[PDB]
Design a protein around this ligand. Structure first.
Ligand SMILES: CCCCCCCCOCCOCCOCCO
Ligand SMILES: CCCCCCCCOCCOCCOCCO
Ligand SMILES: CCCCCCCCOCCOCCOCCO
Ligand SMILES: CCCCCCCCOCCOCCOCCO
Ligand SMILES: CCCCCCCCOCCOCCOCCO
Ligand SMILES: CCCCCCCCOCCOCCOCCO
Ligand SMILES: CCCCCCCCOCCOCCOCCO
Ligand SMILES: [Mg+2]
Ligand SMILES: [Mg+2]
Ligand SMILES: [Mg+2]
Ligand code: NA
Ligand code: NA
Ligand code: NA
Ligand code: NA
Ligand code: NA
Ligand code: NA
Ligand code: NA
Ligand code: NA
Ligand code: NA
Ligand code: NA
Ligand code: NA
Ligand code: NA
Lengths: 341, 340, 341
């Protein structure tokens, strides 16, 4: 958010952050929610907007993740990746259109509870149809309903097939949409998407069906120094899962997902957080029902100003030791310090 | 975008985000361009410092970040440094730079490398003098010691790069170019020759101690019209693969022709037509065979200097009985570009 | 650094360099000090600092290495890596604290002789406990002794365990510190650190012990355009080594290290250099004592201005062709041209 050019109708911001970060869990964290050890990383990105005329804007964004917890040896690149890369046009009262790597439209809903100091947002998987960042997506968005209805918003998204070398990262063609309304510091949102699955996905031992589906609804209140939000969603053939015992992977035939969060902002900078998150797989081959995620969160971010914060995030993991997929059951606490610009 | 300009130093950060999709028959396996999402971003810096009235120092770096991978194990596929060099420019005498930079024969091939998405097929990366290449020292003289506007020449020394593939390797070499541009007209010639490495000589396709590349070009660039043509030949330098025997190496000879015609409408549309043909000769076991053969029709629509969209359509004249197995199917690209 | 932002209490600089670089050694450089061939690279980084209140600033830095001597094929990313990524807080007259990937505290001493145009600094290994850049380190620093004594500094550093997939890049938990006094051209510094070795490091055939130790002292004279410095250090179980003959790796049970440098700065920009570096491993399994580094250096950098330089650096290698670890015995000369901002 450092504007490095603003002339001839063009404005570009370089942005990024350096995050010193450590995770603490029992042992070496192998059976924990979050893992153990150094988790330091940095982000870099640009975001630019050109005012083409008084009625039309063009824009672009790119965002990279650089892990800062690898050695300078052969593992140096582990977890480095492009998060976002897209370009688009915005025509006043008609809408915007962009194409590239961007957030799936179901995240329009899941974004409501994705507000924890470190963790949270567990169902917003990357490269997973409509719930997270995904490649090859064309997105149309409309604010205030062509200007006719203040606060009412909608979006329509086409997902292009990505035939990759893993089932986990692949998808077929799909289409999704979202609608929201925002009022006096409140919002309500619903979003839905459906897509073909690829042959490689259908071939996995877990999950069965030609189509993947995801939807979510969300409600939030954001004002008076208080933030409250809830999401409920369900998926079919879309949430990736691994049975740690049988070394087998694929997609959950169904999941039912709930996330709740409550936060308070003190004027002196401290922002306590609590939350609850549960994701339950159903009809899993050879298992039936089984929790994927189940925890309470207690944490806090201390904002010094717009550029600097520290935080702690504690996950009280309610997953138990006999979880049938072998999901980790131990707690994790993150401690972090962030410089951002 | 100018991010610094103080105490005689000027540095610009630049880049672009390109939303991009290719459409080809089926999975694109037998096509010119492939199929599917091809989105990417570029980031680079370019800087120049005033040392004294006669001398400026400069540096440039440019990276490609693919935007069409997942965030999993494949996340890095096709990520790479395109350019990385630093140099000194002595007024009325010339410039010297060293690093990863364009090969000098690209001084010619740049004339036709102007299509919305495709084109420039013979300017291979890491291929002696015709594209981007590492370990290259380049001397340039713009405007001929200051005496003649538009008259340029260059001499380039290529350092040996013994890499673990023949495709990406090269021995020591030397190359040069000369160009002259006057009132929208332009003519250029370029040639380079270099030793080949042991590993390159070991491949079953291609035989010779030296690689050579040369190309000439003519252009007309004015009155909103752009016309250009390149002709070139190579010896032991164009990489090829026989997909039927799974053998590879370099074409003993190629003869290459590229033509482009474009028109710029004031309202923003720039249509394009082109023709490209690269023919290999003396290929072991085969004789003559086409590597590239197509007509192009395309258009870029310029909103302004920072925003455009485009379509590029490759009408592939290659056919199904091509002796090397070159893809025969057409490809269409559609793109939207934000750049700064 | 190029200032891309300065307002509302926050200043951020983007910085970087492009380095055209070529090494010349006998043959293809396999038996040489430095190697042979193109070595061009670029650096990009950001560094930021925000004034939070009268006594407190927050800061962050990230720095990346992009190799420029690879092809655009499969080897394109070879040697790309994050060098630095950390964030911190600086409390006036009280000290600074940062966490992330940063210099080990023994480098507080080794920096004294790490001044050659291209080479030198041979004992400042990356990912090597306290002597170079390392991940997961928490560092407290105090400049000018709580504001009471100009030129008196100290630091205390905590190293978090990094259990990696190679012994070379791993470490256990550790602690070190440094102290320096720099009065009017003269400087003296001492630094020491110790840490647990991991099971994986213990399992290597070279090196035996539960703990790694490193310490070093430095003396410098930096004034009147003259730069003179000496470093002396010892290590236990901490310097990584490979026996190229037996093709086994691990750590030196002991090393004793000496680095010497002498430089002169002409006002017109030329800066000649001569140096000496010797590092000897002792009690090495199947060998006894063996030289790791042993050379004389002659070189020069020509500084055109703050943004541009060229250099030549020649390493006259004293290592013997019958070195028992197989250390390369051939000389290397580097020639570089650097644009930086
Ligand atoms: C500037 C243009 C950028 C190129 C856009 C590429 C669009 C590909 O994504 C769309 C895929 O199909 C959507 C599915 O709908 C049918 C469902 O049976
Ligand atoms: C005005 C020119 C002054 C030239 C002085 C001599 C320097 C040689 O370097 C230029 C070599 O260019 C080779 C051209 O290839 C043409 C293709 O056949
Ligand atoms: C005519 C001006 C001087 C040369 C200008 C550059 C053109 C180079 O083509 C001629 C070959 O160069 C020397 C030998 O190369 C063999 C490969 O190692
Ligand atoms: C001094 C002599 C005058 C030379 C004038 C410049 C000639 C440029 O040639 C460009 C011809 O391009 C045709 C492209 O067709 C593409 C459709 O298949
Ligand atoms: C509101 C929260 C305030 C928390 C600030 C957190 C800074 C992150 O520091 C991470 C600690 O790393 C420990 C490494 O040392 C291990 C030594 O054996
Ligand atoms: C404050 C104490 C600083 C002591 C600094 C001593 C500088 C040593 O310089 C290197 C020795 O060279 C010995 C022969 O030189 C020929 C090399 O080619
Ligand atoms: C007064 C001492 C200064 C030392 C300057 C040495 C520069 C001479 O070399 C050529 C110029 O550019 C350097 C890059 O070289 C790469 C060539 O492969
Ligand atoms: Mg099902
Ligand atoms: Mg031949
Ligand atoms: Mg020992
Ligand atoms: Na990278
Ligand atoms: Na299945
Ligand atoms: Na499945
Ligand atoms: Na538990
Ligand atoms: Na591309
Ligand atoms: Na060959
Ligand atoms: Na051959
Ligand atoms: Na790294
Ligand atoms: Na051992
Ligand atoms: Na060891
Ligand atoms: Na410099
Ligand atoms: Na020796």
């Amino acid at each position: 958010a450092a504007e490095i050019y603003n002339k001839d109708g063009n404005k570009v911001d370089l942005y990024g952050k350096a995050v010193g970060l450590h995770y603490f869990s029992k042992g070496n964290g192998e059976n924990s929610y979050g893992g153990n050890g150094d988790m330091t990383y940095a982000r870099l990105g640009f975001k630019g907007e050109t005012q083409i005329n008084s009625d039309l804007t063009g824009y672009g964004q790119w965002e990279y993740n650089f892990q800062g917890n690898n050695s300078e040896g052969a593992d140096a690149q582990t977890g480095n990746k492009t998060r976002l890369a897209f370009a688009g046009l915005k025509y006043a009262d008609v809408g915007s259109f962009d194409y590239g790597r961007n957030y799936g439209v179901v995240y329009d809903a899941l974004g409501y509870t994705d507000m924890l100091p470190e963790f949270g947002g567990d169902t917003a998987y990357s490269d997973d149809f409509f719930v997270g960042r995904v490649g090859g997506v064309a997105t149309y968005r409309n604010s205030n309903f062509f200007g006719l209805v203040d606060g009412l918003n909608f979006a329509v998204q086409y997902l292009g097939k990505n035939e990759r070398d893993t089932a986990r990262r692949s998808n077929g063609d799909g289409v999704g949409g979202s609608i929201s309304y925002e009022y006096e510091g409140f919002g309500i949102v619903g979003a839905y998407g459906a897509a073909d699955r690829t042959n490689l996905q259908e071939a996995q031992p877990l999950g069965n069906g030609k189509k993947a589906e995801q939807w979510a609804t969300g409600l939030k209140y954001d004002a008076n120094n208080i933030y409250l939000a809830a999401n409920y969603g369900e998926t079919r053939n879309a949430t990736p899962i691994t049975n740690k015992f049988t070394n087998t992977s694929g997609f959950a035939n169904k999941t039912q997902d709930v996330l709740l969060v409550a936060q308070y902002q003190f004027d002196f900078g401290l922002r306590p957080s609590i939350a609850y998150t549960k994701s339950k797989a159903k009809d899993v081959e050879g298992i039936g029902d089984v929790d994927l995620v189940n925890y309470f969160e207690v944490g806090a971010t201390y904002y010094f100003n717009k550029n600097m914060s520290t935080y702690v995030d504690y996950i009280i993991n309610q997953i138990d030791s006999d979880n049938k997929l072998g999901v980790g059951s131990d707690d994790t606490v993150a401690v972090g310090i962030v410089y951002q610009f």
